[PDB]
Amino acid sequence: METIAKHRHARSSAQKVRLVADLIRGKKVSQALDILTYTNKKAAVLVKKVLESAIANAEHNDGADIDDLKVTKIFVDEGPSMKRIMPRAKGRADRILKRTSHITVVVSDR
Amino acid sequence: ARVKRGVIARARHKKILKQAKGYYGARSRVYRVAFQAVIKAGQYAYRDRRQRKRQFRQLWIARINAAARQNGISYSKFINGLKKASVEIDRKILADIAVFDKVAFTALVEKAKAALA
Amino acid sequence: AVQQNKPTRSKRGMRRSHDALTAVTSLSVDKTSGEKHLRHHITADGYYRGRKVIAK
Amino acid sequence: MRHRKSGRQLNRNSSHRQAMFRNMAGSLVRHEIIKTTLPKAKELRRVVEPLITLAKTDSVANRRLAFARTRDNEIVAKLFNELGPRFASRAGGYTRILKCGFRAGDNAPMAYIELVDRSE
RNA sequence: GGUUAAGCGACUAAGCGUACACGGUGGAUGCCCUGGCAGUCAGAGGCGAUGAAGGACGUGCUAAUCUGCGAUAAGCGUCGG
RNA sequence: CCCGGCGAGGGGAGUGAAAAAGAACCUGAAACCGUGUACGUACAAGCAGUGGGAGCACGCUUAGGCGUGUGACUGCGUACC
RNA sequence: AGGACCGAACCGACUAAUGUUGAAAAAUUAGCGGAUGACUUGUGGCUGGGGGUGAAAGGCCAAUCAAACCGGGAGAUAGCU
């Protein structure tokens, strides 16, 4: 049966996390975890934590078959953003954008 | 009494986007471009409603000329013979016959040739 | 220098084709503890070529 | 444009480069185990291994020349007595580099560097 | 059936475009109002050196705010419901 | 209860008519950002549409050349105020 | 003794470079002049808009000045866009 876990309002850009999400889409969990834990990006650590949470969700809440478990759907969606003011030259002010992301991983044995 | 335009404008926008569903990018998403795309498509459809008859007439005349040329006669001579033979077959049926029925077009061509003399 | 027309999302995603990250496939297999590690690198517990290298 | 040229820049001038090479080499010879970046250790080799080779022979002139480097009396005292006999029968290759991944702060290539045996 | 030569030739999508389905930021639209706006019927049309209007500071079992009050300090006495 | 950092966040169980009502909480569109499906695209030039149109996939129908989704190529076509 | 000289603190900005969505709504670096006097600075007060002040540029009067700012006439007027 399908298991869904997600992380909301993560302090990271959507594009940066999506650059890492495409690396493990459809891959085996056993190798996906190894790829995530040996990738030198903060978004890689975040998606590794989310994947570990999903894996734990697939054994404490689900029956069995951890070895054949495979990630099926992974996607990153942009979340609410924070508006901040960054002073610039000649008294000009620029509205800087801090983007949050919703990282959702969908995993099932099939 | 105050009147809110949030429903009629939304309905008009939805209708316009429906009329221009799937041209390219913003043309199928942005109303400000969708309206111009709809107007241009309507103008093109109006022009082609008349252009189609001319294009199909050109296709039919090309096919009839080719069919007459395999039989050893030009299109103009074939039409002159048909007119002299009191034959009022439109070029669409002539092209259909030439494409599908070879012997029928052969019979038409010798009748035109005989009417020429 | 500044833009004259707004680039479309097609151009944005078309530029990002070469920005995809590359993923390792065959990091290593330890001959003593059998744990994955980088090529020519020590493991988490400082194991390389079978013999301990860090002594914690 | 670097035709048969050697000597890394390390984003530092000559004085700072020499000073931090000296401090790093002193720390290494004191502790026999240092974790640093790959280029830093690679350039450390070309300073420490010649220092060990110089320390292989013990004399007042050699000791003074060694003291001219590392600017430390205790560092020279440890030399010519401990690492001398240990590396007396060794011709080069006194140091080795073991990569250990990357830092979590700036993602820089990390590697441990140590002596041959370390008597441990 | 095999060798040779000529002609034809899709099945590849790093990415993109189109339609559909499922999602995210986004808070318009729909419904509601101890909120406003304009009037009608009546009162009042002023308060105050017996210290005005308006404020500061304190007052609870109180750390803060609103409200009430003023060292008798979210109050006291009398008479009625 | 579990993961997670004795976090944040998430998934279960339960209350709840409803949790596709979870405190960022009624209804939740568009611009914008994605995932999967079907089609086309790596020798082709331009207001990107229109008419024709082979082909490709699915529902038809129990055949009947139907519709939907895309559009190889082709004639014409230099936005709006 | 010098409205004397060189030259620090201090005052000012004559020359060159950087900057021109900068570190800065006029600065920094290298040079420069005055530097015991017509000097500079701290503190407090006064001169308030057809006015003030001005070793005099029609300069300044709160990052503005051939008539400051705030509110009212005022939804000034526009044969203009």
Add this chain to the structure above:
RNA sequence: CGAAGGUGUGCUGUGAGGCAUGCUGGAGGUAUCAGAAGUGCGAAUGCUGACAUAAGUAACGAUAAAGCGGGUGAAAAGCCCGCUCGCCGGAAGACCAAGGGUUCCUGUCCAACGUUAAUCGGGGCAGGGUGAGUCGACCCCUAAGGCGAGGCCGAAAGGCGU
């Protein structure tokens, strides 16, 4: 036994449109006929809010300079300790006035901030901290200057002044 609204499909009209229905939605809507508009948006360098673009590019804010070992910590180039290297040192040191108004110390945490990591902080929460006959303020007096009973002047307001 499903109102408005939203989202699709089909039918229909010379058209602004109308009707039916699938799903969401979960409570009002309203036939026909007459009347009144804050009654129909694509532009006005229109206003408000949200979201693309350059792009994950510049930049991360004086070229005085960091390194090593250990410790806390899940995570240390940035926190603490010890060793060095360098800088200021008529200052980049110390004490005050003006100003700021708890930014001071301790314990605790990374929701937001620091142009990055964060366990750190001038960040959040709680507690504590300021002791004057000799310091200063207060007070006596006074300059520049301000107010100013009587008084003078001036339509009023008000100005000058003992």
